[PDB]
Amino acid sequence: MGPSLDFALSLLRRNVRQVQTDQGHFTMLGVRDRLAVLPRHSQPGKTIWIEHKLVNILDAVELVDEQGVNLELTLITLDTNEKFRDITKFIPENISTASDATLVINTEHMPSMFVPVGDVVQYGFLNLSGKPTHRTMMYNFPTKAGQCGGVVTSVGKVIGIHIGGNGRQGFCAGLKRSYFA
Numbered sequence: 001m002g003p004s005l006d007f008a009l010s011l012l013r014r015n016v017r018q019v020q021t022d023q024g025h026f027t028m029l030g031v032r033d034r035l036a037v038l039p040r041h042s043q044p045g046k047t048i049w050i051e052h053k054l055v056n057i058l059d060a061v062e063l064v065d066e067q068g069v070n071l072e073l074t075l076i077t078l079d080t081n082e083k084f085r086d087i088t089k090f091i092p093e094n095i096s097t098a099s100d101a102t103l104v105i106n107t108e109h110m111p112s113m114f115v116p117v118g119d120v121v122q123y124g125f126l127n128l129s130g131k132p133t134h135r136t137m138m139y140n141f142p143t144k145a146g147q148c149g150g151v152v153t154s155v156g157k158v159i160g161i162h163i164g165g166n167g168r169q170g171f172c173a174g175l176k177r178s179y180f181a
């Protein structure tokens with residue numbers, strides 16, 4: 001195996017999980033310890049179904065910027081026996097673009113799915129489903145419903161979480177390392 005394939009597959013094995021909430025199927029990224037992140041519109045409750053079992057959520061934090069604007073990420077703390085492989089080192093310190101990125105998706109309906117979204121560019125403001133959203137990036141790929149939560153990766157870096165699209169383009173909430181300090 002080569003390095004990019006090894007890194008994405010290792011992500012899938014160790015950090016990228018199949019989940020279901022009242023809102024349906026999402027991909028969840030486990031970041032470190034018992035901390036994971038999901039798209040805010042997943043609306044996780046007191047418990048979330050992860051892979052094969054119902055897991056209790058100890059805390060949820062919906063991220064907003066200084067202006068009070070939605071970042072579309074929710075940080076959840078899980079009541080789990082053991083800790084996620086810490087991948088904060090692979091998340092850049094500031095929101096970063098990339099070339100030839102891959103979107104990694106893992107849902108019961110779309111298990112271990114790799115989508116070659118291409119170049120990921122700065123986008124900023126986005127209005128999705130009526131909610132105004134900052135710090136997003138864009139890829140020119142017609143991503144689908146069911147792909148939210150999907151992890152945007154390139155060259156050994158984890159840079160975003162898929163949050164929507166418009167039938168021609170896809171968007172992610174950018175990730176920065178300080179969200180997970």
Ligand SMILES: *[C@@H](O)[C@H](C[C@@H]1CCNC1=O)NC(=O)[C@H](Cc1ccccc1)NC(=O)OC(C)C
Nearest residue numbers: 041128129131143144145146148163164165166
């Ligand atoms: C995953 O949640 C889903 C994926 C979209 C559907 C088509 N392309 C995609 O990749 N995203 C959405 O459904 C969001 C919903 C959203 C976003 C932010 C805040 C609240 C809800 N987009 C969406 O519904 O698109 C509108 C143009 C209808």
